[PDB]
């Protein structure tokens, strides 16, 4: 080989026991017989909420112009923990 040999080796180039995964994750364990037992505590699910009646869409009308928020006098305007706590007492005090 001259040049293709200097490329990064891939699983589609050789077959003599060369295995390289795609980072799909471990979904179980290997057995001693050559099989695989899927561990469903490692398998992942996708929590999709019911979208029946949901009116919001991924776009906002361009008639409403984009204006950023303002927090005069506070350097940590949006990240102020006091503003989050003080506002919590006003709206929801129980939880």
């Amino acid at each position: 080989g001259l040049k293709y040999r200097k490329l990064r080796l891939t699983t589609k180039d050789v077959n003599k026991g060369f295995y390289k995964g795609n980072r799909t994750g471990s979904m179980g364990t290997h057995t001693s017989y050559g099989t695989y037992k899927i561990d469903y505590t490692k398998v992942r699910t996708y929590v999709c909420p019911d979208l029946t009646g949901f009116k919001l869409t991924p776009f906002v009308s361009k008639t409403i112009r984009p204006v950023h928020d303002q927090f005069p006098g506070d350097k940590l305007g949006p990240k102020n923990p006091a503003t989050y706590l003080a506002r919590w007492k006003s709206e929801n005090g129980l939880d």
């Binding site: 080989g1 040999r5 200097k6 080796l9 180039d13 050789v14 003599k16 060369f18």
Partner: protein, 46 residues
């Protein structure tokens, strides 16, 4: 004269003899990497 010494050459021997792990795991292989890294090589091994 030159000979066809790469006839029947397998890529398993390339990784074993010239691979990255053959060097980071040896005293003399760390020099090759450090040497090739000082020169700016992209292909440090194989």
């Amino acid at each position: 004269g030159p000979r066809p010494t790469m006839s029947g050459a397998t890529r398993l021997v390339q990784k074993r003899r010239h691979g990255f792990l053959s060097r980071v795991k040896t005293k003399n292989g760390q020099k090759t990497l450090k040497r090739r890294l000082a020169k700016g090589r992209l292909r440090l091994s194989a």
